[PDB]
Enzyme design. Structure first.
Site, short mmCIF file in Angstrom:
data_model
loop_
_atom_site.label_atom_id
_atom_site.label_comp_id
_atom_site.label_asym_id
_atom_site.label_seq_id
_atom_site.Cartn_x
_atom_site.Cartn_y
_atom_site.Cartn_z
N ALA A 32 0.82 -1.21 0.00
CA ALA A 32 0.00 0.00 0.00
C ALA A 32 0.86 1.26 0.00
CB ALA A 32 -0.93 0.00 1.20
N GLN A 71 2.81 1.59 -3.54
CA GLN A 71 1.95 1.87 -4.68
C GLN A 71 1.29 3.24 -4.57
OE1 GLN A 71 0.77 -2.53 -6.33
NE2 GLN A 71 -0.74 -1.51 -5.01
N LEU A 98 6.85 20.60 8.89
CA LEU A 98 6.14 19.51 9.54
C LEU A 98 5.70 19.85 10.96
CD1 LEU A 98 8.43 16.53 8.46
CD2 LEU A 98 6.36 17.35 7.31
N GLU A 125 4.54 22.61 12.00
CA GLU A 125 3.35 23.45 11.97
C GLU A 125 2.07 22.61 11.86
OE1 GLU A 125 4.05 26.83 9.44
OE2 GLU A 125 2.00 27.55 9.68
N1 GTP Z 1 -5.54 2.34 -0.82
C1 GTP Z 1 -4.76 1.28 -1.05
N2 GTP Z 1 -4.76 0.23 -0.16
C2 GTP Z 1 -3.97 -0.85 -0.39
C3 GTP Z 1 -3.15 -0.90 -1.51
N3 GTP Z 1 -2.48 -2.07 -1.49
C4 GTP Z 1 -2.85 -2.76 -0.38
N4 GTP Z 1 -3.78 -2.01 0.30
C5 GTP Z 1 -4.45 -2.37 1.56
O1 GTP Z 1 -3.48 -2.79 2.50
C6 GTP Z 1 -3.97 -3.85 3.29
C7 GTP Z 1 -3.02 -5.04 3.18
O2 GTP Z 1 -1.71 -4.59 3.45
P1 GTP Z 1 -0.56 -4.58 2.34
O3 GTP Z 1 0.08 -3.22 2.22
O4 GTP Z 1 -1.12 -5.05 1.02
O5 GTP Z 1 0.46 -5.71 2.87
P2 GTP Z 1 2.01 -5.43 3.19
O6 GTP Z 1 2.24 -4.06 3.79
O7 GTP Z 1 2.82 -5.62 1.92
O8 GTP Z 1 2.35 -6.56 4.28
P3 GTP Z 1 2.63 -8.11 3.90
O9 GTP Z 1 2.36 -8.39 2.44
O10 GTP Z 1 1.77 -8.98 4.78
O11 GTP Z 1 4.08 -8.40 4.21
C8 GTP Z 1 -5.36 -4.19 2.77
O12 GTP Z 1 -6.34 -3.64 3.62
C9 GTP Z 1 -5.39 -3.55 1.40
O13 GTP Z 1 -6.70 -3.19 1.03
C10 GTP Z 1 -3.14 0.17 -2.41
O14 GTP Z 1 -2.42 0.13 -3.40
N5 GTP Z 1 -3.95 1.26 -2.17
#
Ligand code: GTP
Ligand code: ACP
Ligand code: GDP
Ligand code: CA
Ligand code: MG
Ligand code: MG
Ligand code: MG
Lengths: 437, 54, 430, 330
Positions: free
Chosen positions: A12, A15, A252, A254
């Site tokens: 997350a 990306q 930051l 502020e």
């Molecule tokens: N908004 C948003 N949420 C995301 C994205 N990718 C994953 N998530 C959310 O992140 C949560 C899962 O965590 P991730 O970030 O995918 O997993 P990680 O941080 O890589 O941790 P592990 O894979 O378990 O090692 C879920 O609730 C997803 O819906 C994204 O690209 N955008």
């Protein structure tokens, strides 16, 4: 000029990071090349955009950013993507096997084996800062890395950079796109451990932006790409003051000063408008009043809740585009009479306004339409505690039966940390209720 | 409806409007926690390999 | 590049194991010679999970074939996809196990197990990042049951931090080869509860009833039974073999599906149910897939899900369809029958979608349920076990191999404990 | 099939609605803590509004309005009327009231009280105490209340020379349509009103302390048809003109005042709620508001019609199956 380093953790975080830095480059006119024609000062600069970018002698503008993930697929897309030339390899750190949606696995087991490496790569960015002011940390609550490794990183940054501020951009878990049943466990666990180490955290509920994409962008089944493109706009609005000439939220520190009276209560609610589909042929551009009023509609908040039944501690309006103070105050006056907006007795009923004449930049071929004016409201309202309550309820249901707990204990975590973290959240809900009722 | 601290530049402007007035853990400790958890894993794995040995 | 090492043990194990590799090799565009001839990059994006690459861009299954007699393995080598297998990975004895768990676990198989572990090691060393192991076997025989669980115990000793997964075929008098199958099965389950993270319970009772009642096959062969198994196996491994967010590896699946370590016995389901050469022409609508995948008649384990509660569920839809409609229909199932999903595990149903369908279908859906109703399976085996054991019938086959009656008593007790543990959470409330 | 949960067992009104819903064969009741519901008949206190409207694929509705307590609590109602410009300090249908804390508007109450002496009867409401002695009222409080002007000259019903109050049932749906129930009730005192049990028209206080309970009408309850007739015979007017116009005005004023704060028009969940408005009327046929009940019971013979009305207007409107109300237009 004081530099800011962005840390993107997990799928997350990364990306979303990709989305934000893509947008930043468009806003500052930087190419995938890394070149910035408008920057006449070659090889260095004291400019406001240098807060987020460093410069090479060849004139390449490089994000002060580090990407970390305990599994290489996502960051490998960055290494081969459009902006591959933008970053240098030491910024992109990858492991072999991920935390398997397990906080304890990301924090204790795998975290221990890479934490020193990351801090060293962070140290190498900090050594290129004349006056590093702090960090922006992007991560999910739900993932094993995002939750587990982040809390470990946040603990160590407070050690190696005690004077420096640390801001979070956190993705709150939503079933409509969640990939794990235990995300409530991970969320509470990383919140508990990170709380004292974060000065100000912006929570984004995936549920909210998912519906905003359905409702206002007419996207039937939003992808992460759809979600991240919208999130990045919000992040850009929030960080625009750090990257552009202004006098509001220029550092930051502020953010904490303006939005966080009480340290534990450092979760401002973000609200953004307008969100218009690029596929809408005919669209009537919305006025200052119409977009400002939309900042008090729950359907536009990054977290669905009801500020009417809570109290405000602070509010900040961040406009982008054709906006002048007179029209803002006119919109504020009208809105105050019509809506329920009650501050705490020990806070002024007021708004810190910030305007940037450059309208919101939109990614070409994106879902968002170009608008002449937009706003992002940052309000520290007790109503956001509704999100903690939801989360804590799901946690209580599963933990009552010790469901899935063995997965954490097997990674070296003690069962006590569960109840310890839950207690902290119980107190937090209590703090929110005292301030707001 | 009092406006204050109006600041202007070519990029934009900022101000504040008021409607009404009012009425830690050491590096050492971290290394211990990560190592304490590691030993618990190693213990659990040792009990397994002990059970399998039987 | 997270690799899985596949093992198939015994007649049943190698029969379905062979069919499994036939099916997915076709899905990944790999031919019987190991050469790729597909028309999509999605086919090769995670090919390394199940295949090793050789020079000439040859794809070799990471598969180890095990048996105590050369019968079935000679049939595999002479089968269509016989050549694809690594010749040195054919590990076999000559004595056979005679449907005797003790022979496979303590005597005959003990003699061969080290040879197998040598091949496992050579495969594992070549792995960039080994996920773990998947085993295909029956629990009613001697080799796949006795030696199979022996292998599992040894593999766990050398690879204690890797995931152990099994496709375990459960015996049934409707397709029974021997009267001692309840013994072999009870002794095997005892091993699986302790040493596996994920077990797909493939009940021969169910496969028979599906073949007879639904597919209208009056005289079901093992081929008719394995068409159902191969179709199920392909489905449950889709998330592992193609790009995806949900349950993309063995561990993340385990974390999502297994709330308690001992309760990891899954009830698989598949839709639409087809027979070989049926070649049906009308694709199912997303609503049709969803109603059938949850239907008792589509479960590969002879258990009524309405007699228990779902702890966790994993649904996998394959083919070009509306992800909006899938979500709606999946939400519709849960909301219309919320009583059958435990309230103390919120959002316990997870759904995945893969654009690539299985051969012969435009649309398909695979179900994986961790239901407390699976206890019905273990109850059944326990009844058949006690019926004989109360008179110590047929035990001489086992005592002759060194086994004591106590070991049977312990095995029976642990299975009866498993049944009671399922009943505990079937009545539990929030 | 629609689904609903019940989390207030002690609710006579919604026990009937629950029964009615099931009897349609298109509603299934779940366990109270099953979150996958369409409708919630929630608890009276600490209702978890924050967990509503977060269930994908479920339109969720609840039988209470978050924030409606500002209308249904004594001290909050007073503060609402004084501080809200829509109602204003100059509010002619609400008695003179003040909020007092034991051990605040004490100073302001006395300031006006001294004005009175130079009718000065009041009433302290949290056990009640009616007295002309301010010093006595203040003592009673100490050992949070509201001090209100007592209506010394109530309309008295004959034969009996007895007082009464009027209960009106108001249903507000998810669109904030205000629906006044056709039927109301007069909680009568069976005792002759004595200027110097007969002052409190409470049904519980009447049944316990009155010798004359139930001689004039069933359980000291007069309904609108009889009360309307009496008004025509005795005073040459109708219930509609002399009283209901004022009642409809008061109901609208109160609920339209609070609408911006509690409305669920653009919310992720929706609310409806049944209110009970209690009125006194004086000799001059002038209607006054006593209080508002957020969880009102109903008169026995009216449960059937009212509860069916709730289902038709508030529930079936949101969840269609396969008028007794007067719409108070804005
Ligand atoms: N908004 C948003 N949420 C995301 C994205 N990718 C994953 N998530 C959310 O992140 C949560 C899962 O965590 P991730 O970030 O995918 O997993 P990680 O941080 O890589 O941790 P592990 O894979 O378990 O090692 C879920 O609730 C997803 O819906 C994204 O690209 N955008
Ligand atoms: N200001 C006033 N002037 C005259 N009579 C009054 C009065 N306030 C209350 N009363 C009388 O005293 C009774 C007390 O009822 P109150 O409504 O004050 O408490 P309650 O909330 O316990 C009763 P309910 O909820 O059934 O209406 C009223 O019904 C009315 O008959
Ligand atoms: N589905 C299926 N089940 C089989 C097959 N062969 C044997 N079985 C089952 O497995 C049990 C016999 O075990 P078997 O594999 O022959 O023993 P082993 O080879 O010595 O391990 C019986 O319960 C059979 O029903 C097969 O080809 N398909
Ligand atoms: Ca420069
Ligand atoms: Mg990940
Ligand atoms: Mg056989
Ligand atoms: Mg009351």
């Amino acid at each position: 000029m004081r530099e800011c380093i962005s840390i993107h953790v997990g799928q997350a975080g990364v990306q979303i990071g990709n989305a934000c830095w893509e947008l930043y480059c468009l806003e500052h006119g930087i190419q995938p090349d890394g070149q910035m024609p408008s920057d006449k000062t070659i090889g260095g600069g004291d400019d406001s955009f240098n807060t987020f970018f460093s410069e090479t002698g060849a004139g390449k503008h490089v994000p002060r950013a580090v990407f970390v993930d305990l599994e290489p697929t996502v960051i490998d897309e960055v290494r081969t993507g459009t902006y591959r030339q933008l970053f240098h390899p030491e910024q992109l750190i990858t492991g072999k096997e991920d935390a398997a949606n397990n906080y304890a696995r990301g924090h204790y087991t795998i975290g221990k084996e890479i934490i020193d490496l990351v801090l060293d790569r962070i140290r190498k960015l900090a050594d290129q800062c004349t006056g590093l002011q702090g960090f922006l940390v992007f991560h999910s609550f739900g993932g094993g890395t995002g939750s587990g490794f982040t809390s470990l990183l946040m603990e160590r940054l407070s050690v190696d950079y005690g004077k420096k501020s640390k801001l979070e951009f956190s993705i709150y878990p939503a079933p409509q796109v969640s990939t794990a049943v235990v995300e409530p466990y991970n969320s509470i666990l990383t919140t508990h451990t990170t709380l004292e180490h974060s000065d100000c955290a912006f929570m984004v509920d995936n549920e909210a932006i998912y519906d905003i994409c359905r409702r206002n962008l007419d996207i039937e089944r939003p992808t992460y790409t759809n979600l991240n493109r919208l999130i990045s706009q919000i992040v850009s609005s929030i960080t625009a003051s750090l990257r552009f000439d202004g006098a509001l939220n220029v550092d930051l520190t502020e953010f904490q000063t303006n939005l966080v009276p009480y340290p534990r209560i450092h979760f401002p609610l973000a609200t953004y408008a307008p969100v218009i589909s690029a596929e809408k042929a005919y669209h009537e551009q919305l006025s200052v009043a119409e977009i400002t009023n939309a900042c008090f509609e729950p359907a536009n908040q990054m977290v669905k809740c009801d500020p009417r039944h809570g109290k405000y501690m602070a509010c900040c309006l961040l406009y982008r585009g054709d906006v002048v103070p007179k029209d803002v105050n006119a919109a504020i006056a009208t809105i105050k009479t019509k809506r329920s907006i009650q501050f705490v007795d020990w806070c002024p009923t007021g708004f810190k306004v910030g305007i940037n004449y450059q309208p919101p930049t939109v990614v070409p071929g994106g879902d968002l339409a170009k608008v002449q004016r937009a706003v992002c409201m940052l309000s520290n309202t007790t109503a956001i505690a509704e999100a903690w309550a939801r989360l804590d309820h799901k946690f209580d249901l599963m933990y009552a039966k010790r469901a899935f707990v063995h997965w954490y204990v097997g990674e070296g975590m003690e069962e006590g940390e569960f109840s310890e973290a839950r207690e902290d959240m119980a107190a937090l809900e209590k703090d929110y209720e005292e301030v707001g009722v | 409806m009092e406006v204050i601290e109006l600041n202007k530049c070519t990029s934009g402007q900022s101000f504040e409007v008021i409607l009404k007035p009012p009425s830690d853990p050491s590096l050492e400790e971290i290394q211990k926690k990560l190592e304490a958890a590691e030993e618990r894993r190693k213990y659990q794995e040792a009990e397994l390999l002990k059970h399998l040995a039987e | 590049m997270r690799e899985i090492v596949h093992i198939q043990a015994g007649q049943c194990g190698n029969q379905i194991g062979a069919k499994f590799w036939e099916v997915i090799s076709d899905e990944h565009g790999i031919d019987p010679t190991g050469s790729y001839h597909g028309d999509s990059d999605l086919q090769l994006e995670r090919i390394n999970v199940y295949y090793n690459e050789a020079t000439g861009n040859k794809y070799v299954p990471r598969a180890i074939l095990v048996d105590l007699e050369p019968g079935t393995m000679d049939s595999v080598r002479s089968g269509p996809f016989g050549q694809i297998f690594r010749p040195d990975n054919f590990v076999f004895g000559q004595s056979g196990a005679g449907n005797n768990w003790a022979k496979g676990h303590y005597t005959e198989g003990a003699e061969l197990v080290d040879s197998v572990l040598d091949v496992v090691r050579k495969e594992s060393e070549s792995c960039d990042c080994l996920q773990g192991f998947q085993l295909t076997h029956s629990l009613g025989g001697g080799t796949g049951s006795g030696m199979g669980t022996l292998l599992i115990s040894k593999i766990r000793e050398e690879y204690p931090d890797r995931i152990m997964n099994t496709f375990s075929v459960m015996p049934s008098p409707k397709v029974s080869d021997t009267v001692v199958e309840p013994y072999n099965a009870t002794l095997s389950v005892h091993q699986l509860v302790e040493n596996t993270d994920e077990t797909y319970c493939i009940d021969n009772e169910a496969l028979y009833d599906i073949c007879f009642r639904t597919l209208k096959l009056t005289t079901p062969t093992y081929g008719d039974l394995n068409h159902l198994v191969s179709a199920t196996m392909s489905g449950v491994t889709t998330c592992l073999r193609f790009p995806g967010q949900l349950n993309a590896d063995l561990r993340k699946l385990a974390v999502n599906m297994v709330p308690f370590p001992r309760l990891h016995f899954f009830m698989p389901g598949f839709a639409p149910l087809t027979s070989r050469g049926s070649q049906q022409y009308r694709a199912l609508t997303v609503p049709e897939l969803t109603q059938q995948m949850f239907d008792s008649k589509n479960m590969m384990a002879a258990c009524d899900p309405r007699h228990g509660r779902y702890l966790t569920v994993a649904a996998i839809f394959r083919g070009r369809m509306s992800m909006k409609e899938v979500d709606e229909q999946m939400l519709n199932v849960q909301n219309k029958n919320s009583s059958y999903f435990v309230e103390w595990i919120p959002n316990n149903v997870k759904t995945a979608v893969c654009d690539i369908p299985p051969r012969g279908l435009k649309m398909s859906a695979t179900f994986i349920g961790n239901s407390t109703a699976i206890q019905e399976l273990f109850k059944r085996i326990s009844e058949q076990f006690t019926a004989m054991f109360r008179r110590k019938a047929f035990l001489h086959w086992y005592t002759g191999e060194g086994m004591d009656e106590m070991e049977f008593t312990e095995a029976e007790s642990n299975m009866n404990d498993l049944v009671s543990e399922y009943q505990q959470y079937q009545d539990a409330t929030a | 099939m629609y689904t609903f949960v019940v989390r207030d067992e002690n609710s006579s009104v919604y026990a009937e609605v629950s029964r009615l819903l099931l009897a349609t064969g298109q509603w299934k009741r779940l366990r109270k803590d099953n979150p996958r519901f369409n409708l919630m008949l929630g608890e009276r206190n600490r209702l978890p509004f924050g967990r509503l409207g977060h269930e994908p694929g479920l339109v969720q509705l609840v039988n209470y309005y978050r924030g409606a307590d500002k209308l249904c609590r004594k001290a909050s109602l007073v503060k609402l009327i004084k501080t809200s410009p829509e109602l204003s300090e100059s509010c002619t249908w609400f008695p003179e009231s003040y909020v007092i804390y034991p051990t605040d508007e004490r100073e302001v109450f006395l300031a006006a009280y001294n004005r009175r002496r130079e009718g000065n009867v009041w009433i302290a409401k949290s056990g009640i105490l009616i007295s002309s002695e301010a010093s006595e009222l203040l003592d009673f409080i100490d050992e949070v209340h509201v001090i209100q002007k007592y209506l010394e000259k109530p309309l008295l019903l004959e034969p009996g020379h007895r007082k009464f109050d009027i209960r009106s049932w108001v249903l507000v749906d998810h669109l904030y349509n205000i629906y006044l129930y056709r039927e109301g009730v007069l909680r009568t005192s069976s005792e002759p009103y004595n200027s110097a049990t007969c002052h409190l028209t409470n049904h519980c206080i009447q049944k316990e302390y009155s010798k004359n309970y139930g001689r004039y009408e069933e359980g000291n309850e007069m309904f609108f048809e009889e009360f309307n007739q009496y008004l025509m015979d005795a005073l040459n007017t109708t219930l509609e003109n002399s009283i209901l116009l004022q009642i409809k005005h008061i109901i609208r004023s109160c609920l339209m005042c609070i609408e911006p704060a509690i409305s669920t028009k653009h919310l992720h969940y929706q609310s409806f709620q049944l209110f009970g408005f209690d009125f006194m009327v004086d000799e001059e046929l002038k209607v006054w508001l006593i209080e508002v009940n957020g969880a009102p019971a109903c008169a026995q013979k009216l449960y059937a019609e009212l509860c069916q009305g709730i289902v038709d207007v508030a529930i079936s409107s949101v969840f269609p199956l396969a008028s007794i109300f007067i719409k108070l237009h804005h």
